[PDB]
Subunit: 462 residues, 4 copies
């Protein structure tokens, strides 16, 4: 069931059905921290597949045999496509440079490429893990490169598409609710009116600004450390490799990847991950506000606010109609709280670089990818399972509109401030409506009230 | 105008009316960071006066002249009593050990004692700042000692008394509201009933647990670093000074101060400050919930929840007689958010100690004292200007109780689940009450409804 | 391959080899957030098994048929023992009350118990998911109970045992290094000496205080919400159930679980999780200091500090001897940064409770369990793979001791301050040792220097 | 002594020498939270003076009397110029909308303009606080406008100029150190060489990227809420006032202020403040790395790293001539930790908006301005008192270069990997240099070593 390999610490049995080698096995034994929920995120593994596929191509310009290079390229493609996920057992909580995952990727790609060429698994023949798969002689620049490839792909494929669906759904609701006038709330107190569409337009602007903030953090993420090698000097790599491998990654992904103008800044720190995490942290604040507002606007049905009727996803009780738990709102606000904590973890790691190398890399990219996946997935779920199905309780909204004390300022240019203040003061102490009190005081007639108190005329400046 | 003093780097103009000296003026010149709001917190200055008073009394056992020592004690008492606050212009953003503030205290106490002994300001005669006020030869242990004295005093005098007032006022409201039954809210949806007194009893328990958590963080605060000198070995200090000066501080303050059992842990880290900030962070989560709940329970008056009538302390618009903004709730929740941020700042500083000395001390104690003062002051303000004056809107609470669909399960044993659920669904569809629907359906009488649906019987287990 | 079940939203195919039902399947479709790394943590599932096993026993006092109860108890045991982990596919990012995992547990236990009694899977006969497995009529108190059971078990079984191993290993190193005098470092500058054992004794005290801080947060974790039902009143549960099920959980686990004195505080907030997260946050600051110190103390071999020789776990290069990357230090400091971020996520969720129910429960317990597992696992790995094998570079330590300028204060009670200051001032500008300069200046002889400059006499007060 | 003013709750004694009125005195009485260090930041007060000056000029287009308007403009100019700071005693911990500070500004400007028009203080004649100074009928939009004006001005005048000085000084050191080759450090272990100029060029890039990130956060800061009035509809304000007052603020400040495109997003949330705090949080991670690196590179002089000689600005002990504590590094890293905590506080406030108004405004702008002032001031102080005066210890750097084992790979093409690794292992075992070992082994001459091992040839790709 196993083959037998050796490192400088002793004998190791590697399962025959695994493409990793003795380096990966030893790493798994030395870092038993967290369990399988702590394995290196799949986007990082796939990004390594893209990077090795790109380097193998470029390395043909530097002596790499085309028959070996093509075998590496096909094996790297299988990694980048998620076909070999079960051959990467390492946890995030490894070395701070992530080079143990780099050696995991080198072992898997060479062994798979060896098998494609009919060789013996574990022999390093004819595809060597270091001499061929890592022909670039890259070391501490590999994992930084895979971090930015994975972050850029996850932002383009998961985060922004999810937020775009949320933006469009909120915008459709805003237009659908454009003519429903409701009582505003400031300090949670009754305030002058606005429409549900105006309130939802604020949500739309927040999501629009969130997508702009995330895009503004991407230019630095597109800068790749590949070519810096050990300390950023580029020692042991070939001239032109840094630019060529970045341009190849750009062509493989369709994203505007470039080489980092300063490789020492690219290895010694990961401020671009901190800035991207900061944009997602701002997005979390926007989504917390939006989801909590809709949570409260749908509260009820009779002892809450009751403005919105949210779609029911979980089965209720036949004895409890009208009760709809805002469960998509709860999942979204929990995600937002998680992103804020993830950002602090990213911040602590990003601040603790030492000299030529920041060695908090796996934890930083884990929290960045975690935040991006959660925000993208929750935005999709929030959209499809709640936002698109939100209905307005227009009957309740219009009833509370006529019973509110907030429309009384519409009578000031008819009966003066103090007569209007006395109608509101009396109606408050009496539990009566504004119209009922304005007539019982003999200040105006009903036909005058309906002519002067028009809420559609209180939605903008004059 | 000025007197002229000298350090070995040149000459310095010291204002004639100031008790600080050349080293303080040199320190102000090199750390122009933040402005006057960033000056060292007054509790730290006062704590230094306590410490120097204690050291001078103890140092008589090791040869300090009694007339010099008694002048130092009187001058240090003036520092501890807050009479010399304008003689400490240094900001928090100084050296990470805080020894520049230690020298500020040495110069002020020496010059003030010189003045009380008829000498000339700045002469170091007959009271020398280092040889007499700092005769203990302490250095890197002075500021840690002053931190823990200041934190313990602020907890004992401000934080815990403020929370005690809040606890007692909430308990009084709980008893006052013990018979007011209202509709519960889970997920912000209508739920089975409970009393306002039961709900408030939850807040009472949170404040009770908050005080227990803060008290649990104090034993390590009471451990003083005084006696560790430069690196924790106690080099250049006298055997027994550490225990004696701690006992003198205990007798002066009435708080159970003892010497730190391990001086290296006391200088290299300030985990006790992190744990105390953590307890205040937990307290902030409690106060955020309590204050936010009261904010929303008082929302309205007509489109909010409207269960509570909060006191109106600042005048509002006469045109708006029903609006009472919960401004005390807003100050409390803003304070809670500030404590959470302050805790992260304490955490980053606490994590970044280097070898024998953590040099983040001034920023750590600044945030700890900030959180304690804000939490204590806000609790007092929230208590006096909101909690004690809260009234229940029993008229609205009773009306919404009768209109709620949540009481329908009381009919289950009398008419069966199927008929009860039919009453609930028809009442929800028609916008009618359970009683109206149950009789229009011929399922029971009005007399059977009044006898079977008793909310006072739905407040506990059977 | 499937059976066919129905909910109120349509037909659902449930795999025959799964014990969950249509409720779990529908929940999996409505909350596609995060992937399989986001599944509910295993300690929560096992804790549900303990809770249901305990309730099934107690419910025999309330009519539950002993033949059904015993079937439930054996099925719950299989859950609590980790035999049915593959039947829980729900993610953390579900409803904020965690009741969808509660229904997942109810479906699995009843279906497995049905199979133990030879029934048809998915029939609810003779073991009903609600009528029998959830006979307590518990709702919003189930997940809070499982949270505290899981947290208490993880602290007792993983966190504290891991820290205890670290404490003992650091203590052994402290005693082993008790006689190795080295130059201290304050502000990273050369300071007066101390021993490696004294420096390591500070680490020991930090870990000891960390275990005390975690234990101090446990009394409130031991309080269980079981019995509060929907809003904390205990409506629909039987008198005495809350106390009995807590005492049964205590007997099943061997831990001092009790019922919560105030069930409204137990449902509306999770301040005990915030306080436990705060204790782990303080522990993270201690471990960050300890691991970073050892990281830097082992730096070198020739351009660093070079005081410690750390064990080599990853294979190096045969051309690069003496290079040992402190990879266990990096994994530990990354874990510490992750705990600090997790604490903020816990803090945000714990602060956002609404009225009768905090609906951030799954996210809060996920981050608490994550922090406890990481700290416990990393402490074990740090201990076994680094601390126990640390060696001291006594040759380098003694060489820098004799070349340091820091021992010059030992000559002040022989030649006075100013003669000693001139030896240090000259030796600094000359690149010479203190003894070489003291003789070249003719201030003392060699035999006098060795008699007066004794570093073993500079390790404590006099 | 005092004058007597009146609100509708009673009478208030206003000090004779103060320009504030009854509403300010009422506000101070009800919010005794924090003390004088907690007063509203001066940049917010000054920004209010700018805003009121702008509104008064624009309001002439809507009928405001020119002589009244010109008196308001002159009084508002005195507020903006910092001449009336002692007339604003309100703390940050007030109402969450900040309207109490808005009224403070209205009363001060009205009373000062009354004084300039010969009237009596407190008379509201001829300049009324609400009818004239607040003629725009703005309310909940005033403080948000003042926040963004204050943040934009502090970024333009303090933060960015401070970072610009730091960038330029670091760039100058990078050029000055361009030929000094030293041993690199990855994982704090000795690594392949690089120049001090290359290492410093990494810091230069981080500061350059920090300024780009902060500038990227400004477009949404430049959007002003002025014109949204109570809920964002703009009710009670004039059409065109929003655009005109923003254009007037732009002309007065020279900054590209525009009106917010969506006033509901502008009042209900302050995500722009969260994004700007995020950029400052990223900057803090950069400065923490830069300052901590320089701290450790200057450590020593004899048991540290010793590569840099930092300037000595405060006198030290003459007995300790080689000790120079990096106090500017400590103030910078303490500031960086404070910014990270401030960011969490901003985040919690930004996430907790309710419906039409976020009522965490004063605490959010307090932390934003605190971070900007500290970062700007510290960057200037760190630049002038440390960076510009840094010297390289080239003697020590060159000695450690020759003693390092990291240059051995330069022998690989000339003698082979196996002999080169033997030289490295023997030099490491003997405590000797590569050159000494290579010749005692008969592997090469001293002349071959000098010609083959050229560190200037190991600073880039081949
Ligand atoms: Cl590569
Ligand atoms: Cl002292
Ligand atoms: Cl149960
Ligand atoms: Cl205005």
């Amino acid at each position: 069931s196993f083959r037998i390999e050796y490192d400088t610490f002793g004998e190791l049995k590697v399962p025959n059905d695994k493409y990793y080698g003795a380096q990966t096995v030893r790493s798994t034994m030395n870092f038993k921290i967290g369990g399988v929920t702590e394995r290196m995120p799949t986007p990082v593994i796939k990004a390594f597949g893209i990077l090795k596929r790109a380097a193998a191509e470029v390395n043909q310009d530097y002596g790499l045999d085309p028959k070996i290079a093509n075998a590496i390229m096909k094996a790297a493609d299988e990694v980048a496509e998620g076909k070999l996920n079960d051959h990467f057992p390492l946890v995030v909580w490894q070395t701070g440079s992530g080079t143990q995952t780099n050696m995991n990727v080198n072992e898997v790609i060479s062994n798979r490429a060896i098998e494609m060429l009919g060789g013996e698994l574990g022999s390093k023949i004819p595809v060597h893990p270091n001499d061929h798969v890592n022909k670039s002689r890259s070391s501490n620049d590999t994992f930084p490169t895979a971090m930015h490839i994975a972050a850029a792909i996850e932002v383009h494929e998961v985060l922004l598409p999810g937020l775009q669906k949320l933006h469009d759904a909120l915008d459709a609701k805003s237009k659908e609710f454009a003519q429903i006038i409701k009582i505003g709330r400031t300090h949670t107190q009754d305030a002058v009116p606005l429409t549900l569409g105006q309130e939802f337009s604020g949500y739309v602007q927040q999501v629009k600004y969130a997508m702009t903030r995330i895009k503004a953090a991407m230019p630095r993420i597109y800068e790749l450390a590949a070519g810096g090698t050990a300390v950023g000097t580029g020692l042991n790599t070939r001239i032109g490799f840094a630019e060529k491998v970045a341009a190849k990654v750009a062509a493989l992904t369709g994203l505007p990847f470039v080489t980092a103008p300063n490789k020492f800044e690219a290895l010694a720190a990961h401020d671009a991950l901190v800035e991207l995490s900061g944009a997602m942290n701002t997005t979390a604040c926007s989504l917390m506000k939006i989801a909590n507002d809709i949570r409260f606007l749908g509260s009820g049905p009779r002892s809450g606010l009751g403005e919105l009727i949210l779609p029911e996803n979980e089965p209720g009780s036949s004895i409890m109609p009208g009760k709809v738990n805002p469960t998509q709102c709860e999942a979204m606000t929990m995600v937002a709280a998680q992103v804020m904590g993830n950002h602090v973890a990213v911040t602590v790691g990003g601040s603790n670089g030492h000299f030529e190398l920041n060695v908090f890399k796996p934890m930083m990219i884990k929290n960045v990818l975690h935040s991006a996946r959660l925000l993208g997935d929750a935005s999709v779920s929030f959209t499809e399972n709640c936002v698109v199905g939100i209905q307005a309780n227009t009957e309740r909204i219009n009833k509370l509109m006529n019973e509110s004390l907030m429309l009384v300022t519409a009578l000031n240019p008819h009966i003066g401030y103090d007569k209007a203040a006395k109608i509101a003061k009396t109606a408050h102490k009496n539990g009566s409506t504004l119209k009922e009190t304005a007539i019982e005081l003999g200040y105006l007639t009903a036909e005058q009230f309906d002519e002067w108190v028009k809420p559609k005329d209180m939605l903008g400046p004059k």
